[PDB]
Amino acid sequence: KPLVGTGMERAVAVDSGVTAVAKRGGVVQYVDASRIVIKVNEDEMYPGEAGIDIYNLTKYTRSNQNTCINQMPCVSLGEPVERGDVLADGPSTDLGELAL
Amino acid sequence: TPEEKLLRAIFGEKASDVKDSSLRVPNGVSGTVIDVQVFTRDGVEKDKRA
Amino acid sequence: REEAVVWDILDEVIREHPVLLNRAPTLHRLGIQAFEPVLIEGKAIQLHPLV
């Protein structure tokens, strides 16, 4: 994480797709280093199909520059998450901020 | 040539009709193998590993 | 095989045997200068500050 910062680092991390952002808010049903399954809140949920949002995380893989791009879950089992919250950090991102 | 022929004669090695093109790790770089992909022409039999 | 015994043999061929060092924009003749090699662990070239 940058110890000294500006406040853009959060925005740069999120707007770039490197991280994984919540589609809809709710409580985390399942947390694995592989995927993340969120049980949607009913106010945000559509009537049909009910649903849960399943995020399949990217794991260790080659970048164009031959670096490693790997996502890590930043949330814990059964925790409230709101829409537009960071679900998993990407490479060089910490808890939603941008750490280069 | 003559002296290579004596060498094989002494040590009794059958020099193959095939030359070695095998892919080997570049000099000095060392790591762990995390994946293997096998692409095959359509119609050639996929080998065991593939 | 990089057998351990070879490093000492290299110290022989290196001792008195200058090497040429050169930088990117060679301007005057000092852009290339001869030095006596010193074997150093690591992948970086070390260069005397005064030069």
Binding site: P2, L3 | - | G42, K43, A44
Partner: protein, 50 residues
């Protein structure tokens, strides 16, 4: 604003402190500035260029 946060920090306003050489253990004349700087590793890494 920075100096006040250093007051809350328990650390001097000058931002400099006394440092001791780990070899002789003796002090260093003058205070030296010590702190925390964010530092990046660019990829020129030596075992490519070489």
């Amino acid at each position: 604003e920075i100096k006040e946060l250093l007051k809350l920090g328990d650390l001097p306003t000058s931002g400099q402190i006394r440092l001791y050489d780990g070899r002789t253990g003796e002090q260093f004349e003058r205070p030296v500035t010590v702190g925390y700087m964010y530092m990046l590793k660019l990829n020129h890494l030596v075992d490519d260029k070489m």
